[PDB]
Amino acid sequence: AAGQNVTYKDYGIKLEFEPRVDDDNNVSMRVLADVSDIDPATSVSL
Amino acid sequence: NFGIITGVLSTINFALSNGDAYLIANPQLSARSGGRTDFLAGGQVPILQAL
């Protein structure tokens, strides 16, 4: 609401990995890959 | 007292402009049947959004 709490946001290189393996070593997986950097062009001042 | 006081003014314009813009975006993905894949190549901007 309103118009206080402080939160922290991650940035940089991030990986998440959830593998699953079969008897033939087949891999079923979900992977998240994120690369982010701070951009001065779109930063505001409040 | 009978008379008149009046006049005219003018402005000259000779503006001329042209513009072109081209873009192609070719993203490619891979996913398994029954699954889902999301892709973003861009940025994020902060927005004020509160109840």
Coordinates of C-alpha atoms in Angstrom, one line a residue:
Chain A
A1 CA 0.0 0.0 0.0
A2 CA 0.9 3.7 0.5
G3 CA 2.4 6.1 -2.0
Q4 CA 8.5 1.4 4.8
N5 CA 9.9 -2.0 3.7
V6 CA 13.3 -2.6 2.1
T7 CA 13.9 -5.5 -0.3
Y8 CA 17.1 -6.8 -2.0
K9 CA 17.3 -7.8 -5.7
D10 CA 19.8 -10.2 -7.1
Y11 CA 21.8 -9.4 -10.2
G12 CA 24.8 -10.9 -12.0
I13 CA 25.1 -14.5 -13.2
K14 CA 22.4 -16.9 -11.9
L15 CA 21.9 -20.7 -12.6
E16 CA 19.2 -23.1 -11.4
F17 CA 19.4 -26.8 -12.3
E18 CA 16.9 -29.7 -11.7
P19 CA 18.1 -32.9 -13.4
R20 CA 16.6 -36.4 -13.7
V21 CA 18.5 -39.4 -15.0
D22 CA 17.4 -42.6 -16.7
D23 CA 18.9 -46.1 -16.9
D24 CA 20.6 -45.1 -20.3
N25 CA 21.9 -41.9 -18.7
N26 CA 19.4 -39.7 -20.6
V27 CA 18.9 -36.4 -18.7
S28 CA 15.6 -34.7 -18.4
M29 CA 16.1 -31.2 -16.9
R30 CA 14.8 -27.7 -16.3
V31 CA 17.5 -25.0 -16.5
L32 CA 17.4 -21.3 -15.8
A33 CA 20.3 -19.1 -17.0
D34 CA 20.3 -15.4 -16.3
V35 CA 23.0 -12.7 -17.0
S36 CA 22.1 -9.2 -15.8
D37 CA 24.0 -6.0 -15.3
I38 CA 23.2 -2.6 -13.8
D39 CA 22.3 -0.1 -16.6
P40 CA 22.9 3.6 -15.8
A41 CA 20.7 4.8 -18.7
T42 CA 17.4 3.6 -17.3
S43 CA 18.1 4.3 -13.6
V44 CA 15.8 6.8 -11.8
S45 CA 16.6 9.1 -8.8
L46 CA 13.4 9.2 -6.8
Chain B
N1 CA -12.5 61.1 -34.3
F2 CA -12.7 58.8 -37.3
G3 CA -9.9 56.7 -38.6
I4 CA -8.2 53.3 -38.7
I5 CA -4.9 51.7 -37.6
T6 CA -4.1 48.2 -38.9
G7 CA -1.4 46.0 -40.4
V8 CA -0.4 42.5 -41.3
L9 CA 2.5 40.1 -40.5
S10 CA 3.8 36.9 -42.1
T11 CA 6.1 34.0 -41.6
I12 CA 8.1 32.0 -44.2
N13 CA 8.4 28.2 -44.1
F14 CA 10.6 25.9 -46.1
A15 CA 11.0 22.8 -43.9
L16 CA 11.7 19.4 -45.4
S17 CA 12.4 16.1 -43.6
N18 CA 12.7 12.4 -44.3
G19 CA 13.1 9.3 -42.2
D20 CA 13.8 5.5 -42.6
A21 CA 14.0 2.7 -40.1
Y22 CA 14.9 -1.0 -40.5
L23 CA 14.9 -3.9 -38.0
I24 CA 15.0 -7.7 -38.1
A25 CA 14.8 -9.9 -35.0
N26 CA 15.6 -13.6 -35.3
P27 CA 15.3 -15.4 -32.0
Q28 CA 15.5 -19.2 -31.8
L29 CA 14.4 -21.6 -29.1
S30 CA 14.4 -25.2 -28.1
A31 CA 11.9 -27.1 -26.0
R32 CA 10.6 -30.7 -25.5
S33 CA 7.1 -31.8 -26.3
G34 CA 4.8 -31.0 -23.4
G35 CA 7.3 -28.5 -21.9
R36 CA 7.8 -24.8 -22.1
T37 CA 10.7 -22.4 -22.8
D38 CA 10.8 -18.6 -22.2
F39 CA 13.4 -16.2 -23.6
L40 CA 14.1 -12.5 -22.9
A41 CA 16.8 -10.4 -24.6
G42 CA 16.4 -6.8 -23.3
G43 CA 16.2 -5.0 -20.0
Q44 CA 14.0 -4.1 -17.0
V45 CA 12.8 -0.7 -15.9
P46 CA 11.5 0.2 -12.4
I47 CA 7.8 1.1 -12.1
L48 CA 5.8 2.3 -9.1
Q49 CA 2.9 0.0 -8.5
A50 CA 1.3 -0.2 -5.1
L51 CA -2.1 -1.0 -3.7

